[PDB]
Structure 1
């Protein structure tokens, strides 16, 4: 979804993977807030009680039971955090039956999309190019540095598998709401998967540096119904 003006927290999710990511982050924040509160409280006690005091306890310097209790407690926190992280890492992926393939080639300062299916006997394969609409040519109501002239169209409730490469330099395919972020190196093919649960318009931007115009390279994904997808694919 689109960024909000005074944002404080994540964008809205449209895929199970981003929901798992949000749940994991909100799980870790628990222990992080606990530790920060403990440290701040001890600093407050030190400032409020022992500030410019007459008695100095210069003979408490060793400790033996207490030193085992700030080396075992933090370990348990790390294990508790690491359980759900490993479960999420191994569980979520394209276990069964991917349903579509879209090649997203990243050239210097624009994008190229190819649909690996819908092939005729002669190689009629549907493909197009996505550029950024300049500020001078914008119509009333369009977003600046995020609106394109050609946008990817996909159905709802269908697994989409993205194969990402590059032709000039190292790029990054990123749509925040969908939880998709892979690189595009010049000599390998990377792949991810996404499932969209609701209809709408989903915006994204590049991440890795590529040169002069790194800030004008948006990505726009629409999730139309199946009837509209069938009509659109029979027009291009």
Structure 2
């Protein structure tokens, strides 16, 4: 939900997409650690038993019965790591019957959010701009370069569809613990889905070089239960 100092792993998941991304990453890292242990063990044992070898076996050049094996074996380990990757790829793309759309438009160094479903009693579209709290006006306890003045509030256990675009340059709507990363280019509208499984607040940032205010461009998502979402939306 937030980066921690000296961390070395993912942020804690909140969507099924991110919890699948974590499992695919660990499944890949399994066989990656097998291959790393193999080649590092060979690279250790060879230079520790043949640095002190005074006769070089200079007639070993072909090895036919094992070149085919170390061509074939990387291919089957590629197949094994590629089997769940295709399943996740073709699972994360379907945006089937969402209960909410939210547009996120990246301007130069603010984001502009727009709930556009008219489920309100007001019946009008809800938009607001969320700027970074500057460093001199941070009241005490606030997270530097992460906190904003307004927030994007989303209900939990709801299929949400984020439609992402930009206005002037290319930005990136990215939240890692939700596991959404989507380029905001000024010509087109992309979409991602999410289902938030737990309430809380999740931070993200513009992951595309927007210019001189690129570091000062954060995303803050408060996921609440659906009553509290409704009473938030009744104002703005």
Report the TM-score when normalising by structure 1: 0.95
Residue 8 of structure 1 and its aligned partner are, at CA, apart by 0.7
CA distance in 1, matches of 2:186, 2:95: 27
CA distance in 1, matches of 2:72, 2:156: 48
C-alpha distance after superposition, 1:178-211 (max 9, x if no partner) = 0111111111111111110111011011011111
Q: Secondary structure at the match of 2:18?
A: helix
Q: Which residue of 2 aligns with 1:82?
A: 82
CA contact (8 A) 1:119 1:125 kept: no
Q: Which residue of 2 aligns with 1:186?
A: 186
Q: Which residue of 2 aligns with 1:24?
A: 24
Q: Which residue of 2 aligns with 1:105?
A: 105
Q: Which residue of 2 aligns with 1:195?
A: 195
CA contact (8 A) 1:170 1:210 kept: yes
Q: Secondary structure at the match of 2:112?
A: strand
Q: Secondary structure at the match of 1:65?
A: helix
CA contact (8 A) 1:102 1:116 kept: yes
Q: Which runs of 4+ in 1 moved over 4 A?
A: 119-123
Residue 135 of structure 1 and its aligned partner are, at CA, apart by 1.1
Kindly report the root-mean-square deviation, in angstroms, between the aligned alpha carbons of the 2 structures. Answer: 1.7
Q: Secondary structure at the match of 2:70?
A: coil
Which 5+ residue runs of structure 1 have no aligned equivalent?
none
What are the within-5 Å matches in structure 2 for residues 71-220 of structure 1? 71-118=71-118, 124-220=124-220
CA contact (8 A) 1:172 1:207 kept: yes
Report the TM-score when normalising by structure 2: 0.95
CA 1:156–1:123: 2 relative to 1, 3 Å: closer
CA distance in 2, matches of 1:42, 1:110: 52
CA distance in 2, matches of 1:122, 1:202: 28
Q: Secondary structure at the match of 2:71?
A: coil
Q: Which residue of 2 aligns with 1:48?
A: 48
Residue 121 of structure 1 and its aligned partner are, at CA, apart by 11
CA 1:198–1:83: 2 relative to 1, 3 Å: same
CA 1:120–1:32: 2 relative to 1, 3 Å: closer
Which 5+ residue runs of structure 2 have no aligned equivalent?
none
Q: Secondary structure at the match of 1:71?
A: helix
